[PDB]
């Protein structure tokens, strides 16, 4: 027959771009068809929406032909059970895989035969439309019921909803799902993450009434200052046309109904033939209406009811209503006449351990930790979400920019599909389909056409066609250079504030540079900036700097929230400075003035409070708490109480914080959202060290120098020019010599895309590697020992050789005193032709591990020359296992700079100097392929470097370390003390 | 299998708007594969294009599931023989049809079966791809080739092109083509036509090289004053890419080669990922180019050629090439620079006696008469015509409009479709492939996005494509008001010159207020216009005057050619009014001197001389020829010589004529382009006649009056009060009273859409019949007879009565003198509140029919008073034949106005008055449905009127005479003279 496998799959309507679906229902809002309107109002389970979630059979064949003819009858004996919201790869069936013939696929096409046995009642089955929905099957798929033959569908992002009631019988029924791996649709869904198939969004069954609700949208319109405004619903229905159906909107704050509207089918006049006789519009107005924001999202329920003039009700509907305007005048992005600063995040649907699977839980997780870290906007990734998702973003409030299920960046020209008419009709669909579905939703404020797909015709057709349909909100595109016809933004990825990249035929302009070309007008929002792959998310202040001064510049979306954290949503140290350098309250200090001014565009400052404290060298002297009464956008002058004066020795440090007494709906009673600090005043210390009478005794033999004073003594290696061993008592300190160190491991932007085979001679890692920075052997040029009046002075000088080049020479004197401290002074020249060194300092292997590690410098957490700011001057104490940063690819981490003191165990370093303390040696760290392969050595170890090299993160590809964060100076010059508890 | 009926029929592919074809091959401009660049450039027969058109095997079917099994594989014993280029209905298997569920079609779907047997050499199948074109089947189409299932198409009026290289077989082989009535397509191709069905468009074989090209096209670029020209050919190629791959294009003019170019492939980079491959770009430098344009179709023959490095040629394309710029710019259509003014016509393809095939003879004899009328331009009338047709209005010169196969009045909102985005595909196609195959014709100026299908998004997306793909041409669209934001152009269908047509939500302003509307900046051409239908076109010269006066009023298109002329080709009176109104040249007369304007934009008057001549009541004094010497948009001053100055009675004549001496591709020696008349001087006659010395004599009785002079005797009904008799000798001259009559057989613009079932009472037909007019019967109210002294002196007066009420009174006057002549003043009331009469004047049947019709008057054509400019003053002679118009619907026609002396047989009226005469009476046409019914009285029928109602034209279906050609004065006067050969 034709519903045989063998005929369903002759025509391989996979391997077509021309067919998409078959039997497929149209696209709309999602529905639940209550049939009472105090559920629907208050959002309760509809009974009339039935979940398959659940167990079903799944069997794996390698090729759609494989599949046996009694599949379709019958659920196989080898078949097993699985949970059907779930991907086949995440079970063990193929290789997952992260990775042409543009209209064909490869034979070898696995495919996953799922197979469910359910129960339909009666009632159901008497009256009414029943329709099964797939929110998500990856690529395309053939569905049976019974054994017959009822469609096909493709785009895995999307619903796909067919007519079952011809198909079902009352009792037992069988369905049988055919998901196929790849199809044609593959070609527009050509992105960069785990690919993975089945069955990976929720299954249900809906009933409808022979008569239903089959569309609406609501529209917003505001007076000037949005103090009047009107509710415009447009409601189709689906059936026989009767003239005693009636529909009423009903829009609900609470429990109070503020508006509704009633009245009998039939539309306004539209052409010459007349109007929709199955379409009515609803006009409700609201007096003071309640606007929608990403800071207070005000909510209204807007319920749709179907019934009789008599006033039966057949069906009803619902959905949340937000006020609010987006539109782009004079350049800018405004939100209710406001211009909008976006605090972007880039977001993928990743479970924690289901792959691609997404519920509420983490959904949830996921918003409180970006509402928290001062983050207002999220970019779903690449194609549209799951429903709830958009939800959840209308109720705690967060901008969210809904980007169609079209990617094709494999492409040899990149535009070969979307120059291509033959493709037009397949792309429309994943277009349209989009808008008919989250177009009610508040949180959506941008429509995005897709993803590097180039610039093609099918691009501005699919452009104009959103702004007809929906002329609501901006529609933006990247491709073709960010800044066509297309979009109404320009949004450049990955685009430099203040360096131009002009690539031939699409330059990457500096963001600066760009707004000022002539002619151009738009607004600039990165859709993709601050790559946060590994230790990155260097120069992250110098992009919020630009966004702050430049008005069209409006922000951006910062790449991979999940990325800024782990699996796990474990925070990486990047997010601290990301949540700083988007904090809602800006200061200023002036004298003992602090300027507190608000960069939030509608609410007052009624959960904020001000916690000042100054402190000496991690000392508090002082503190206080000022409530904060700030409007939106003013400015709050708070003038301190005198401030202690100290005439000990040091810096004095101020620090403000923003708290929130009260807990919120995204955060609990007591969360910092601001803070900043400042350096008040510094006493230089001119006081000398006690006269110590005792005086270093040094020992000279041909093999070492042995200076010795009390219990300690220092050994220092004749031959090699570096202190070999030091005792306290009997004990060793060191299992390996301090010795000057200029590599760091590679990190993640130091490498590039600089793999084995495809080398990049451009990334800092290949030039260290050629210049020999890393193979450069320390040869000893002099090493003399003098015996002082008071002290002992060690002089040696070292050359860093590679293939008969000196590379770096240093230089460093060592004077132990008789108090028993060491002052070491470290001159180091380095070649100008060479590549600029990451760090310049030492390094050594302690003997000792302790559990706690204390030192007086910048922060908590790690820090970077270029990521630095977020962190704070104090004093810090930490395990050691909070220095160590576990990146899944191990590299240089856990850096702490400005530090003025460290102390570890019994030993006390002091200066102006960076370092970083772990159990990992830098050699391991970069021979180590992934951190589950990294194991703990014997001791310590410990590096300190006077200067160290800046971190990339404009991109992960290509070399983004700013000339002020290089070493370039070419003569460096850094002083340590190193003391003991004496 | 699933080659067989059942599993091809089982998915109902025709009733799935989402399947518009299956394995059909990309649309692409005409190609040849010639294996010969000398034969290319020539346009000589390809031998690598082979014609299957001839005789076919034809089965009829009342469903598509009636077709048995055995079709697919031997030819039927019923199945008869036809030429496949036909549609089956002129062969009578289904009635045609010149005249819902938006998805579905009707199960009772009939079924045309084509079936050729074919031969194929073996030199095709070693090598090649080869490919069968079919250029059009109406509505769907499945087909087979040796029994095997090959594809399915839809879009009548586009070719439809699949490979066919894996299915034939060496030697003998078999087609199979299922063609269906209704699809799905049937709902975007429903226009007002013959619908028909069938292969109505060529059917052949394409032998391509397995390296081929696969699409090209050229691009021209001007500098400020086309002095140098730049031609861009971007050729693509399909198939394997060699490094010795070559493509040369060659410009030539003639037989002189003037351009050369020649590259590898390997276009410019695109965009990040790279460019095309399987592209390349050549620019073409040409000096002091050609311009192409309608007045001077300048031609140039690009050859593409597809050859190796070494010199050995692959393929080779050719096509013509005219070099010309159109934009919009200022609110102004630019042609090369300058502002066109459109003289077109809309044009279906509609053969003569073969319904919808179009063949080269009958395309080449509709463009000659066009141009011979001075049209430039044609409208392809609702869907992409025959590829043969462009080429022709390449080589001719005509501005052509080319329309997407899209047109949906039947829809009750009328946008239910394009405002659907699940029919955005099938648009998609249709305006795709049109732009695809026809972007290289010079005569496509404008695209066209279809015709009367409201307006959706899925215009306005269709829009943006064309203008990104070809920005080119201006892209035009009537629907939603023809000003929506789908047009370049506002185009409205039939709006008036001077009346506003307020429709709501798609008013219809007059065309002088519609571009002076609030924010309106776009130039106005009227898509259609001047409705032909019948006796029709009235009110022409208005419009032509709106043009030549408003900048921005740029022409429009008359609506079916064909309409202005017959099936046979035989022109229409109104055609000779359109030729008058559309001439190049327009004349001004000031004393003496004659002014002559040019209104060509690029050529010199250098085929043209002026023909004047001077005559007095139809009688020639003088005459002479001046060559003209007129720049483009110049003026010539010609100052005639000493007219003569003639002082018997009677208005002088001048009449200038345009006479081409030399023979054009369209039009042969002598060709009259341009005409004007003038009054030049009357001479009021003053001399009585002689003083005849007889006195009619007369004699009364109770039932007539009887005046009797010589052999000439009146005869007058005293009960009815007219002229009853009047005998010659002993012959009676009348058959018929001579009464008032002050109605016309209806005008097809008279009846509008007023059928017998919906009525329209503001029909003038309508108002006419509940008035009375047809049915008031005439009351004599007084009848007297004196005797003068030289004359006999009858009196009569009479009311025309309808249900208690006088519409018309009428008191006429009868003057027999004794010369024999007869004087008749009429004088008329007319009640205000009835309808103004269609007429006012006399009728009376003849008993002698005579040969020759001579009268001193307008025009030989037929003329009415709103279409009488094109008419001239002469004595003109014809035969009685040529004095009626055989329209098809029979109606009022044959009018003659501004006469002053009518000539039949022995009979002479004189006077100021206006006639028709004929076999056929008023009450003859008015009841016989079409024109084959109608048969000869026993005499001649004739109508003289002092006054006529102007006819309509502007619509159809509703009124649209003017005010100041409607009988509303209330009182009319007019006098006539009869005599005889005496």
Same mark, same amino acid.
């Given at each position: 027959?034709?519903?045989?496998?063998?005929?369903?799959?002759?025509?391989?309507?996979?391997?077509?771009?021309?067919?998409?679906q078959?039997?497929?229902?149209?696209?709309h809002?999602?529905?639940?068809?209550?049939?009472?309107?105090?559920?629907?109002?208050?959002?309760?389970?509809?009974?009339?929406?039935?979940?398959?979630?659940?167990?079903?059979?799944?069997?794996?064949?390698?090729?759609?032909?494989?599949?046996?003819?009694?599949?379709?009858?019958?659920?196989?004996?080898?078949?097993?059970?699985?949970?059907?919201?779930?991907?086949?790869?995440?079970?063990?069936?193929?290789?997952?895989?992260?990775?042409?013939?543009?209209?064909?696929?490869?034979?070898?096409?696995?495919?996953?035969?799922?197979?469910?046995?359910?129960? !339909?009642?009666?009632?159901?089955?008497?009256?009414?439309?029943?329709?099964?929905?797939?929110?998500?099957?990856?690529?395309?798929?053939?569905?049976?019921?019974?054994?017959?033959?009822?469609?096909?569908?493709?785009?895995?992002?999307?619903?796909?909803?067919?007519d079952?009631?011809?198909?079902?019988?009352?009792?037992?029924?069988?369905?049988?799902?055919?998901?196929?791996?790849?199809?044609?649709?593959?070609?527009?869904?050509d992105?960069?993450?785990?690919?993975?198939?089945?069955?990976?969004?929720?299954?249900?069954?809906?009933?409808?009434?022979? +008569?239903?609700?089959?569309?609406?949208?609501?529209?917003?319109r505001?007076?000037?200052?949005?103090?009047?405004?009107?509710?415009?619903?447009?409601?189709?229905?689906? #059936?026989?046309?009767?003239?005693?159906?009636?529909?009423?909107?009903?829009?609900?704050?609470?429990?109070?109904?503020?508006?509704?509207?009633?009245?009998?089918?039939?539309?306004?006049?539209?052409?010459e033939?007349?109007?929709?006789?199955?379409?009515?519009?609803?006009?409700?107005?609201?007096?003071?209406?309640?606007?929608?924001?990403?800071?207070?999202?005000?909510?209204?329920?807007? !319920?749709?009811?179907?019934?009789?003039?008599?006033?039966?009700?057949?069906?009803?509907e619902?959905?949340?209503?937000?006020?609010?305007?987006?539109?782009?005048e004079?350049?800018?992005?405004?939100?209710?006449?406001?211009?909008?600063?976006?605090?972007?995040?880039?977001?993928?649907?990743?479970?924690?351990?289901?792959?691609?699977?997404?519920?509420?839980?983490?959904?949830?997780?996921?918003?409180?930790?970006?509402?928290?870290?001062?983050?207002?906007?999220?970019?779903?990734?690449?194609?549209?979400?799951h429903?709830?998702?958009?939800?959840?973003?209308?109720?705690?409030?967060?901008?969210?920019?809904?980007?169609?299920?079209?990617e094709?960046?494999?492409?040899?020209?990149?535009?070969?599909?979307?120059?291509?008419?033959? /493709?037009?009709?397949?792309?429309?669909?994943?277009?349209?389909?989009? !808008?008919?579905?989250?177009?009610?939703?508040?949180?959506?404020?941008? /429509?995005?056409?897709?993803?590097?797909?180039?610039?093609?015709?099918?691009?501005?057709?699919?452009?104009? /066609?959103?702004?007809?349909?929906?002329?609501?909100?901006?529609?933006?595109?990247?491709?073709?250079?960010?800044?066509?016809?297309?979009?109404?933004?320009?949004?450049?990825?990955?685009?430099? !504030?203040?360096?131009?990249?002009?690539?031939?035929?699409?330059?990457?302009?500096?963001?600066?540079?760009?707004?000022?070309?002539?002619?151009?007008?738009?607004?600039?929002?990165?859709?993709?900036?601050?790559?946060?792959?590994?230790?990155?998310?260097?120069?992250?202040?110098?992009?919020?700097?630009?966004?702050?001064?430049?008005p069209?510049?409006?922000?951006?979306?910062?790449?991979?929230?999940?990325?800024?954290?782990?699996?796990?949503?474990?925070?990486?140290?990047?997010?601290?400075?990301?949540?700083?350098?988007?904090?809602?309250?800006?200061?200023?200090?002036?004298?003992?003035?602090?300027?507190?001014?608000?960069?939030?565009?509608?609410?007052?400052?009624?959960?904020?409070?001000?916690?000042?404290?100054?402190?000496?060298?991690?000392?508090?002297?002082?503190?206080?708490?000022?409530?904060?009464?700030?409007?939106?956008?003013?400015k709050?002058?708070?003038?301190?109480?005198?401030?202690?004066?100290?005439?000990?020795?040091?810096?004095?440090?101020?620090?403000?914080?923003?708290?929130?007494?009260?807990?919120?709906?995204?955060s609990?009673?007591?969360?910092?959202?601001?803070?900043?600090?400042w350096?008040?005043?510094?006493?230089?210390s001119?006081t000398?060290?006690?006269?110590?009478?005792?005086?270093?005794?040094?020992?000279?033999?041909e093999?070492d120098?042995?200076?010795?004073?009390?219990?300690?003594?220092?050994?220092?290696?004749?031959?090699?020019?570096?202190?070999?061993?030091?005792?306290?008592?009997?004990?060793?300190?060191?299992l390996?010599?301090?010795?000057?160190?200029?590599?760091?491991?590679?990190?993640?932007?130091?490498? #590039?895309?600089?793999?084995?085979?495809?080398?990049?001679?451009?990334? /800092?890692?290949?030039?260290?590697?050629?210049?020999?920075?890393?193979?450069a052997?320390?040869?000893?040029?002099?090493?003399?020992?003098?015996?002082?009046?008071?002290?002992?002075?060690?002089?040696?000088?070292?050359?860093?050789?590679?293939?008969?080049? +000196?590379?770096?020479?240093?230089?460093?004197?060592?004077?132990?005193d008789?108090?028993?401290?060491?002052?070491?002074?470290?001159?180091?020249?380095?070649?100008?032709?060479?590549?600029?060194?990451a760090?310049? #300092?030492?390094?050594?292997?302690?003997?000792?591990?302790?559990?706690?590690?204390?030192?007086?410098?910048?922060?908590?957490?790690?820090?970077?020359?270029?990521?630095?700011?977020?962190?704070?001057?104090?004093?810090?104490?930490?395990?050691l296992?909070?220095?160590?940063?576990?990146?899944?690819?191990?590299?240089?981490? #856990?850096?702490?700079?400005?530090?003025?003191?460290?102390?570890?165990?019994?030993?006390?370093?002091?200066?102006?100097?960076?370092?970083?303390?772990?159990?990992?040696?830098?050699?391991?760290?970069?021979?180590?392929?992934?951190?589950?392969?990294?194991?703990?050595?014997?001791?310590?170890?410990?590096?300190?470097?006077?200067?160290?090299?800046?971190?990339?993160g404009?991109?992960?590809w290509?070399?983004?370390?700013?000339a002020?964060?290089?070493?370039?100076?070419?003569?460096?010059?850094?002083?340590?003390?190193?003391?003991?508890?004496?």
């Amino acid at each position: 027959i034709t519903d045989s496998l063998a005929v369903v799959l002759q025509r391989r309507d996979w391997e077509n771009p021309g067919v998409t679906q078959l039997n497929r229902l149209a696209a709309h809002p999602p529905f639940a068809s209550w049939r009472n309107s105090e559920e629907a109002r208050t959002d309760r389970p509809s009974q009339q929406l039935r979940s398959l979630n659940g167990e079903w059979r799944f069997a794996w064949f390698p090729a759609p032909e494989a599949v046996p003819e009694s599949w379709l009858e019958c659920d196989l004996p080898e078949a097993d059970t699985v949970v059907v919201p779930s991907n086949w790869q995440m079970h063990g069936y193929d290789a997952p895989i992260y990775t042409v013939n543009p209209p064909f696929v490869p034979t070898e096409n696995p495919t996953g035969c799922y197979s469910l046995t359910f129960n !339909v009642d009666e009632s159901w089955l008497q009256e009414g439309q029943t329709r099964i929905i797939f929110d998500g099957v990856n690529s395309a798929f053939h569905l049976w019921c019974n054994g017959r033959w009822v469609g096909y569908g493709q785009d895995s992002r999307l619903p796909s909803e067919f007519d079952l009631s011809a198909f079902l019988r009352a009792g037992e029924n069988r369905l049988a799902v055919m998901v196929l791996r790849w199809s044609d649709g593959s070609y527009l869904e050509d992105q960069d993450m785990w690919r993975m198939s089945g069955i990976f969004r929720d299954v249900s069954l809906l009933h409808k009434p022979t +008569t239903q609700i089959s569309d609406f949208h609501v529209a917003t319109r505001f007076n000037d200052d949005f103090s009047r405004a009107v509710l415009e619903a447009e409601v189709q229905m689906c #059936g026989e046309l009767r003239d005693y159906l009636r529909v009423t909107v009903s829009l609900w704050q609470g429990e109070t109904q503020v508006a509704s509207g009633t009245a009998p089918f039939g539309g306004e006049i539209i052409d010459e033939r007349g109007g929709y006789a199955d379409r009515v519009t609803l006009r409700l107005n609201v007096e003071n209406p309640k606007l929608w924001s990403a800071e207070i999202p005000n909510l209204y329920r807007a !319920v749709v009811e179907l019934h009789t003039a008599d006033g039966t009700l057949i069906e009803a509907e619902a959905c949340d209503v937000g006020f609010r305007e987006v539109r782009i005048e004079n350049g800018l992005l405004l939100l209710n006449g406001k211009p909008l600063l976006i605090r972007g995040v880039n977001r993928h649907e990743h479970h924690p351990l289901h792959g691609q699977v997404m519920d509420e839980q983490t959904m949830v997780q996921d918003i409180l930790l970006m509402k928290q870290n001062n983050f207002n906007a999220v970019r779903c990734s690449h194609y549209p979400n799951h429903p709830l998702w958009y939800t959840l973003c209308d109720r705690y409030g967060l901008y969210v920019v809904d980007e169609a299920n079209i990617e094709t960046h494999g492409m040899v020209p990149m535009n070969r599909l979307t120059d291509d008419p033959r /493709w037009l009709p397949a792309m429309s669909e994943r277009v349209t389909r989009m !808008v008919q579905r989250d177009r009610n939703h508040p949180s959506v404020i941008i /429509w995005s056409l897709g993803n590097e797909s180039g610039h093609g015709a099918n691009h501005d057709a699919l452009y104009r /066609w959103i702004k007809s349909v929906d002329p609501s909100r901006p529609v933006q595109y990247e491709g073709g250079g960010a800044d066509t016809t297309a979009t109404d933004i320009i949004c450049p990825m990955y685009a430099r !504030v203040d360096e131009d990249q002009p690539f031939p035929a699409v330059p990457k302009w500096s963001i600066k540079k760009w707004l000022s070309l002539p002619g151009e007008t738009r607004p600039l929002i990165l859709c993709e900036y601050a790559h946060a792959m590994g230790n990155s998310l260097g120069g992250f202040a110098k992009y919020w700097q630009a966004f702050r001064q430049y008005p069209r510049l409006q922000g951006g979306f910062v790449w991979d929230w999940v990325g800024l954290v782990f699996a796990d949503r474990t925070p990486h140290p990047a997010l601290t400075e990301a949540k700083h350098q988007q904090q809602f309250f800006q200061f200023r200090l002036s004298g003992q003035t602090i300027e507190v001014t608000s960069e939030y565009l509608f609410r007052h400052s009624d959960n904020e409070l001000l916690h000042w404290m100054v402190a000496l060298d991690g000392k508090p002297l002082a503190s206080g708490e000022v409530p904060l009464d700030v409007a939106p956008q003013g400015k709050q002058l708070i003038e301190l109480p005198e401030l202690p004066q100290p005439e000990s020795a040091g810096q004095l440090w101020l620090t403000v914080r923003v708290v929130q007494p009260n807990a919120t709906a995204w955060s609990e009673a007591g969360h910092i959202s601001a803070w900043q600090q400042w350096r008040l005043a510094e006493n230089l210390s001119v006081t000398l060290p006690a006269a110590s009478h005792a005086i270093p005794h040094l020992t000279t033999s041909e093999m070492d120098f042995c200076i010795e004073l009390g219990n300690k003594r220092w050994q220092f290696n004749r031959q090699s020019g570096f202190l070999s061993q030091m005792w306290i008592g009997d004990k060793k300190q060191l299992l390996t010599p301090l010795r000057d160190q200029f590599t760091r491991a590679p990190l993640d932007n130091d490498i #590039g895309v600089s793999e084995a085979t495809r080398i990049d001679p451009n990334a /800092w890692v290949e030039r260290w590697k050629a210049a020999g920075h890393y193979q450069a052997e320390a040869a000893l040029l002099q090493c003399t020992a003098d015996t002082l009046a008071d002290a002992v002075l060690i002089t040696t000088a070292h050359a860093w050789q590679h293939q008969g080049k +000196t590379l770096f020479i240093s230089r460093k004197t060592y004077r132990i005193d008789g108090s028993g401290q060491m002052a070491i002074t470290v001159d180091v020249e380095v070649a100008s032709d060479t590549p600029h060194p990451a760090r310049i #300092g030492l390094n050594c292997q302690l003997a000792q591990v302790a559990e706690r590690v204390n030192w007086l410098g910048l922060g908590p957490q790690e820090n970077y020359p270029d990521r630095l700011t977020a962190a704070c001057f104090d004093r810090w104490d930490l395990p050691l296992s909070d220095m160590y940063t576990p990146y899944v690819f191990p590299s240089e981490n #856990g850096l702490r700079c400005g530090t003025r003191e460290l102390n570890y165990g019994p030993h006390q370093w002091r200066g102006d100097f960076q370092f970083n303390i772990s159990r990992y040696s830098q050699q391991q760290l970069m021979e180590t392929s992934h951190r589950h392969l990294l194991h703990a050595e014997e001791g310590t170890w410990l590096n300190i470097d006077g200067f160290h090299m800046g971190i990339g993160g404009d991109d992960s590809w290509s070399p983004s370390v700013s000339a002020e964060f290089q070493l370039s100076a070419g003569r460096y010059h850094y002083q340590l003390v190193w003391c003991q508890k004496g």
